[PDB]
Tab-separated table of N, CA and C and ligand atoms in Angstrom:
chain	number	residue	atom	x	y	z
A	1	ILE	N	0.834	-1.195	0.000
A	1	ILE	CA	0.000	0.000	0.000
A	1	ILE	C	0.867	1.242	0.000
A	2	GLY	N	2.049	1.174	0.611
A	2	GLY	CA	2.961	2.302	0.578
A	2	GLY	C	3.521	2.629	-0.788
A	3	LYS	N	3.461	1.702	-1.736
A	3	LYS	CA	4.009	1.965	-3.060
A	3	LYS	C	3.000	2.553	-4.023
A	4	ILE	N	1.716	2.234	-3.865
A	4	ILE	CA	0.680	2.941	-4.606
A	4	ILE	C	0.833	4.434	-4.403
A	5	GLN	N	1.076	4.836	-3.158
A	5	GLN	CA	1.143	6.246	-2.806
A	5	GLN	C	2.325	6.928	-3.482
A	6	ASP	N	3.461	6.243	-3.587
A	6	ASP	CA	4.600	6.793	-4.314
A	6	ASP	C	4.324	6.864	-5.807
A	7	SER	N	3.927	5.753	-6.408
A	7	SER	CA	3.697	5.727	-7.842
A	7	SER	C	2.656	6.740	-8.287
A	8	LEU	N	1.675	7.067	-7.453
A	8	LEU	CA	0.755	8.126	-7.841
A	8	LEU	C	1.300	9.503	-7.506
A	9	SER	N	1.890	9.676	-6.329
A	9	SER	CA	2.449	10.955	-5.931
A	9	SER	C	3.564	11.433	-6.846
A	10	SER	N	4.186	10.538	-7.607
A	10	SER	CA	5.312	10.908	-8.454
A	10	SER	C	4.862	11.277	-9.858
A	11	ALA	N	-0.859	8.707	-15.043
A	11	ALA	CA	-1.441	7.404	-14.736
A	11	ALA	C	-2.972	7.440	-14.802
A	12	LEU	N	-3.546	8.612	-14.569
A	12	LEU	CA	-4.983	8.800	-14.742
A	12	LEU	C	-5.300	9.303	-16.139
A	13	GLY	N	-4.734	8.655	-17.152
A	13	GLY	CA	-4.992	9.059	-18.514
A	13	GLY	C	-6.386	8.761	-19.002
A	14	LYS	N	-7.011	7.694	-18.511
A	14	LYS	CA	-8.364	7.384	-18.936
A	14	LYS	C	-9.367	8.401	-18.422
A	15	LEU	N	-9.101	9.015	-17.279
A	15	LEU	CA	-9.966	10.081	-16.806
A	15	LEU	C	-9.667	11.402	-17.475
A	16	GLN	N	-8.401	11.638	-17.801
A	16	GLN	CA	-7.995	12.877	-18.453
A	16	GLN	C	-8.503	12.930	-19.890
A	17	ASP	N	-8.623	11.763	-20.513
A	17	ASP	CA	-9.097	11.673	-21.888
A	17	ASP	C	-10.533	12.172	-22.005
A	18	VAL	N	-11.414	11.625	-21.174
A	18	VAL	CA	-12.818	12.015	-21.181
A	18	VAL	C	-12.965	13.530	-21.106
A	19	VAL	N	-12.238	14.144	-20.178
A	19	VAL	CA	-12.285	15.593	-20.001
A	19	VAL	C	-11.820	16.315	-21.262
A	20	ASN	N	-10.675	15.896	-21.802
A	20	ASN	CA	-10.136	16.524	-22.992
A	20	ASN	C	-11.085	16.435	-24.179
A	21	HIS	N	-11.698	15.278	-24.415
A	21	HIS	CA	-12.596	15.134	-25.560
A	21	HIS	C	-13.781	16.089	-25.469
A	22	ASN	N	-14.396	16.191	-24.297
A	22	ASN	CA	-15.528	17.084	-24.135
A	22	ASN	C	-15.140	18.540	-24.332
A	23	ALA	N	-14.007	18.970	-23.780
A	23	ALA	CA	-13.559	20.342	-24.005
A	23	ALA	C	-13.206	20.622	-25.458
A	24	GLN	N	-12.537	19.690	-26.127
A	24	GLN	CA	-12.225	19.853	-27.537
A	24	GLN	C	-13.474	19.939	-28.394
A	25	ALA	N	-14.558	19.282	-27.991
A	25	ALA	CA	-15.790	19.407	-28.761
A	25	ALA	C	-16.513	20.716	-28.471
A	26	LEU	N	-16.553	21.129	-27.210
A	26	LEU	CA	-17.197	22.395	-26.896
A	26	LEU	C	-16.471	23.576	-27.521
A	27	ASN	N	-15.157	23.485	-27.698
A	27	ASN	CA	-14.449	24.586	-28.336
A	27	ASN	C	-14.717	24.627	-29.829
A	28	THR	N	-14.747	23.472	-30.476
A	28	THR	CA	-15.118	23.417	-31.876
A	28	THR	C	-16.525	23.932	-32.120
A	29	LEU	N	-17.436	23.758	-31.168
A	29	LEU	CA	-18.774	24.301	-31.352
A	29	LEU	C	-18.770	25.822	-31.376
A	30	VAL	N	-18.018	26.459	-30.482
A	30	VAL	CA	-17.991	27.915	-30.433
A	30	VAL	C	-17.187	28.493	-31.589
A	31	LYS	N	-16.107	27.834	-31.985
A	31	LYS	CA	-15.302	28.325	-33.091
A	31	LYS	C	-16.029	28.279	-34.423
A	32	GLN	N	-17.209	27.684	-34.487
A	32	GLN	CA	-17.990	27.679	-35.710
A	32	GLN	C	-18.887	28.889	-35.830
A	33	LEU	N	-19.010	29.682	-34.777
A	33	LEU	CA	-19.813	30.896	-34.808
A	33	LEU	C	-19.093	32.013	-35.548
A	34	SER	N	-17.967	31.689	-36.163
A	34	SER	CA	-17.209	32.675	-36.908
A	34	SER	C	-16.826	32.156	-38.274
A	35	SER	N	-17.715	31.408	-38.906
A	35	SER	CA	-17.556	31.000	-40.289
A	35	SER	C	-18.725	31.541	-41.087
A	36	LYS	N	-18.476	31.811	-42.366
A	36	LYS	CA	-19.486	32.406	-43.229
A	36	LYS	C	-20.450	31.380	-43.782
A	37	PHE	N	-19.956	30.188	-44.100
A	37	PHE	CA	-20.697	29.180	-44.847
A	37	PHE	C	-21.190	29.708	-46.181
A	38	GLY	N	-20.496	30.682	-46.759
A	38	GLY	CA	-20.929	31.272	-48.010
A	38	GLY	C	-21.865	32.443	-47.822
A	39	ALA	N	-21.446	33.407	-47.014
A	39	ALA	CA	-22.207	34.618	-46.793
A	39	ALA	C	-21.224	35.775	-46.794
A	40	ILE	N	-21.741	36.990	-46.666
A	40	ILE	CA	-20.862	38.147	-46.725
A	40	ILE	C	-20.097	38.369	-45.432
A	41	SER	N	-20.657	37.993	-44.290
A	41	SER	CA	-19.910	38.042	-43.041
A	41	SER	C	-20.423	36.946	-42.120
A	42	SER	N	-19.945	36.980	-40.878
A	42	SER	CA	-20.357	36.049	-39.838
A	42	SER	C	-21.211	36.724	-38.784
A	43	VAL	N	-21.519	38.004	-38.952
A	43	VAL	CA	-22.212	38.790	-37.949
A	43	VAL	C	-23.583	39.149	-38.499
A	44	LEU	N	-24.616	38.975	-37.682
A	44	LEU	CA	-25.945	39.360	-38.127
A	44	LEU	C	-26.141	40.866	-38.103
A	45	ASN	N	-25.395	41.575	-37.264
A	45	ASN	CA	-25.437	43.028	-37.277
A	45	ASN	C	-24.680	43.627	-38.451
B	1	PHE	N	-23.954	48.481	-26.023
B	1	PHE	CA	-22.827	49.393	-26.124
B	1	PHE	C	-22.214	49.391	-27.516
B	2	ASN	N	-21.528	50.495	-27.811
B	2	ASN	CA	-20.740	50.652	-29.030
B	2	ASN	C	-19.476	51.420	-28.645
B	3	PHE	N	-18.324	50.771	-28.802
B	3	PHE	CA	-17.016	51.357	-28.520
B	3	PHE	C	-16.275	51.528	-29.840
B	4	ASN	N	-16.378	52.728	-30.411
B	4	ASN	CA	-15.808	53.122	-31.698
B	4	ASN	C	-15.789	51.989	-32.712
B	5	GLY	N	-16.914	51.307	-32.875
B	5	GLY	CA	-16.992	50.245	-33.851
B	5	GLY	C	-17.414	48.921	-33.258
B	6	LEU	N	-16.918	48.604	-32.065
B	6	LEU	CA	-17.282	47.367	-31.374
B	6	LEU	C	-18.720	47.482	-30.898
B	7	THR	N	-19.610	46.699	-31.488
B	7	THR	CA	-21.014	46.691	-31.093
B	7	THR	C	-21.267	45.447	-30.255
B	8	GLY	N	-21.873	45.627	-29.082
B	8	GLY	CA	-22.192	44.476	-28.259
B	8	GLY	C	-23.228	44.705	-27.181
B	9	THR	N	-23.428	43.702	-26.333
B	9	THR	CA	-24.366	43.772	-25.224
B	9	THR	C	-23.734	43.123	-24.005
B	10	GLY	N	-24.025	43.665	-22.835
B	10	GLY	CA	-23.557	43.035	-21.619
B	10	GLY	C	-23.380	44.035	-20.503
B	11	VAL	N	-22.917	43.511	-19.388
B	11	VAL	CA	-22.541	44.275	-18.209
B	11	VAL	C	-21.087	44.690	-18.350
B	12	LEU	N	-20.808	45.950	-18.024
B	12	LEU	CA	-19.465	46.520	-18.070
B	12	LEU	C	-18.954	46.637	-16.647
B	13	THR	N	-17.694	46.289	-16.429
B	13	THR	CA	-17.140	46.311	-15.084
B	13	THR	C	-15.698	46.803	-15.100
B	14	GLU	N	-15.288	47.472	-14.023
B	14	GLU	CA	-13.911	47.932	-13.901
B	14	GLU	C	-12.951	46.756	-13.918
B	15	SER	N	-11.882	46.884	-14.693
B	15	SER	CA	-10.954	45.787	-14.879
B	15	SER	C	-9.739	45.929	-13.979
B	16	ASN	N	-8.884	44.912	-14.039
B	16	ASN	CA	-7.572	44.991	-13.413
B	16	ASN	C	-6.506	44.346	-14.292
B	17	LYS	N	-6.780	44.159	-15.579
B	17	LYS	CA	-5.785	43.765	-16.559
B	17	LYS	C	-5.103	44.994	-17.137
B	18	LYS	N	-3.990	44.761	-17.825
B	18	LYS	CA	-3.175	45.839	-18.372
B	18	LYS	C	-2.831	45.529	-19.819
B	19	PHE	N	-3.501	46.206	-20.745
B	19	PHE	CA	-3.208	46.062	-22.163
B	19	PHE	C	-1.824	46.611	-22.480
B	20	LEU	N	-1.365	46.423	-23.693
B	20	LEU	CA	-0.223	47.215	-24.120
B	20	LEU	C	-0.719	48.512	-24.739
B	21	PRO	N	0.029	49.598	-24.656
B	21	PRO	CA	-0.568	50.895	-24.974
B	21	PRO	C	-0.763	51.127	-26.459
B	22	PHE	N	-1.187	50.101	-27.160
B	22	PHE	CA	-1.736	50.263	-28.495
B	22	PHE	C	-2.877	49.297	-28.748
B	23	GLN	N	-3.267	48.495	-27.763
B	23	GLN	CA	-4.299	47.483	-27.922
B	23	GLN	C	-5.626	48.037	-27.431
B	24	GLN	N	-6.674	47.830	-28.221
B	24	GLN	CA	-7.998	48.373	-27.949
B	24	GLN	C	-8.866	47.436	-27.125
B	25	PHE	N	-9.055	46.206	-27.582
B	25	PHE	CA	-9.913	45.266	-26.890
B	25	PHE	C	-9.216	43.922	-26.768
B	26	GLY	N	-9.679	43.122	-25.811
B	26	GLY	CA	-9.141	41.810	-25.559
B	26	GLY	C	-10.131	40.719	-25.923
B	27	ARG	N	-9.578	39.569	-26.282
B	27	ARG	CA	-10.379	38.440	-26.716
B	27	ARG	C	-10.064	37.235	-25.855
B	28	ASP	N	-11.003	36.300	-25.815
B	28	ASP	CA	-10.840	35.054	-25.093
B	28	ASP	C	-10.373	33.956	-26.041
B	29	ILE	N	-10.073	32.798	-25.480
B	29	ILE	CA	-9.928	31.581	-26.261
B	29	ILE	C	-11.331	31.214	-26.708
B	30	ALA	N	-11.456	30.784	-27.962
B	30	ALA	CA	-12.719	30.647	-28.689
B	30	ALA	C	-13.180	31.994	-29.227
B	31	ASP	N	-12.347	33.020	-29.070
B	31	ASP	CA	-12.466	34.266	-29.817
B	31	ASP	C	-13.755	35.045	-29.574
B	32	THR	N	-13.995	35.477	-28.342
B	32	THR	CA	-15.090	36.390	-28.049
B	32	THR	C	-14.537	37.597	-27.311
B	33	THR	N	-15.000	38.783	-27.686
B	33	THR	CA	-14.567	40.015	-27.035
B	33	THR	C	-14.947	39.993	-25.567
B	34	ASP	N	-13.971	40.181	-24.689
B	34	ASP	CA	-14.269	40.162	-23.266
B	34	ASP	C	-13.704	41.341	-22.499
B	35	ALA	N	-12.916	42.193	-23.131
B	35	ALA	CA	-12.476	43.432	-22.513
B	35	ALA	C	-12.418	44.507	-23.579
B	36	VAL	N	-12.578	45.761	-23.168
B	36	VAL	CA	-12.403	46.902	-24.052
B	36	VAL	C	-11.629	47.972	-23.308
B	37	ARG	N	-11.204	48.980	-24.054
B	37	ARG	CA	-10.581	50.166	-23.504
B	37	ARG	C	-11.429	51.364	-23.897
B	38	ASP	N	-11.759	52.207	-22.929
B	38	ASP	CA	-12.598	53.357	-23.229
B	38	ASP	C	-11.769	54.403	-23.947
B	39	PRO	N	-12.156	54.830	-25.136
B	39	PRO	CA	-11.306	55.746	-25.902
B	39	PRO	C	-10.994	57.047	-25.177
B	40	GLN	N	-11.972	57.613	-24.475
B	40	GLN	CA	-11.778	58.933	-23.888
B	40	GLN	C	-10.899	58.882	-22.644
B	41	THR	N	-11.220	58.012	-21.692
B	41	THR	CA	-10.459	57.956	-20.452
B	41	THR	C	-9.354	56.908	-20.468
B	42	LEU	N	-9.381	55.970	-21.423
B	42	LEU	CA	-8.326	54.963	-21.621
B	42	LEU	C	-8.194	54.026	-20.423
B	43	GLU	N	-9.310	53.445	-20.006
B	43	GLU	CA	-9.314	52.450	-18.948
B	43	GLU	C	-9.958	51.169	-19.438
B	44	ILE	N	-9.467	50.054	-18.923
B	44	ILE	CA	-9.881	48.737	-19.375
B	44	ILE	C	-11.121	48.327	-18.599
B	45	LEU	N	-12.106	47.792	-19.309
B	45	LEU	CA	-13.372	47.373	-18.733
B	45	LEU	C	-13.711	45.983	-19.242
B	46	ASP	N	-14.066	45.084	-18.330
B	46	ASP	CA	-14.505	43.756	-18.729
B	46	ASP	C	-15.954	43.761	-19.166
B	47	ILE	N	-16.272	42.813	-20.039
B	47	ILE	CA	-17.584	42.681	-20.644
B	47	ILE	C	-18.111	41.308	-20.280
B	48	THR	N	-19.020	41.258	-19.341
B	48	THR	CA	-19.628	39.979	-19.047
B	48	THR	C	-21.034	39.926	-19.617
B	49	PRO	N	-21.468	38.745	-20.047
B	49	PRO	CA	-22.809	38.577	-20.616
B	49	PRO	C	-23.898	38.817	-19.577
C	1	LIG	C1	-11.473	63.347	-24.517
C	1	LIG	O1	-12.000	64.568	-24.073
C	1	LIG	C2	-12.278	64.610	-22.666
C	1	LIG	C3	-12.933	65.939	-22.406
C	1	LIG	O2	-13.844	66.271	-23.445
C	1	LIG	C4	-10.994	64.405	-21.874
C	1	LIG	O3	-11.317	64.364	-20.488
C	1	LIG	C5	-10.324	65.044	-19.695
C	1	LIG	O4	-9.465	64.100	-19.020
C	1	LIG	C6	-8.463	64.701	-18.181
C	1	LIG	C7	-7.646	63.570	-17.598
C	1	LIG	O5	-6.295	63.615	-18.042
C	1	LIG	C8	-9.119	65.568	-17.114
C	1	LIG	O6	-8.114	66.202	-16.330
C	1	LIG	C9	-10.006	66.607	-17.776
C	1	LIG	O7	-10.671	67.391	-16.792
C	1	LIG	C10	-11.032	65.921	-18.668
C	1	LIG	N1	-11.899	66.900	-19.301
C	1	LIG	C11	-13.219	66.929	-19.100
C	1	LIG	C12	-13.970	68.015	-19.814
C	1	LIG	O8	-13.783	66.114	-18.380
C	1	LIG	C13	-10.337	63.101	-22.306
C	1	LIG	O9	-9.076	62.955	-21.663
C	1	LIG	C14	-10.150	63.079	-23.822
C	1	LIG	N2	-9.593	61.809	-24.252
C	1	LIG	C15	-8.291	61.525	-24.184
C	1	LIG	C16	-7.891	60.168	-24.675
C	1	LIG	O10	-7.476	62.323	-23.744
């Protein structure tokens, strides 16, 4: 039990992955609010 | 609000960031305006939704 504590204190990639994927998708969603898709601008004003 | 071209909506608040003395407004990651500089008094103000 004393070695678990060292090996961690010094591995949680499966938890870090989930977080990264969700953030990478939420950023791609917002970065699409600045494309024209074939219009004169990206702003309704 | 309209700051010499920047058109937007939101609450304006006194800031504590420091632009460089040629930068007008600040942007976030994902590219949304979140700070401005008032042209007349030259102070930085945050823009919250
Ligand atoms: C724009 O004009 C206003 C006045 O019309 C300037 O305001 C002055 O600011 C100084 C601060 O350095 C004060 O001492 C003066 O009393 C202010 N004048 C008035 C009438 O309030 C303002 O500074 C100008 N913009 C810039 C960037 O200088």
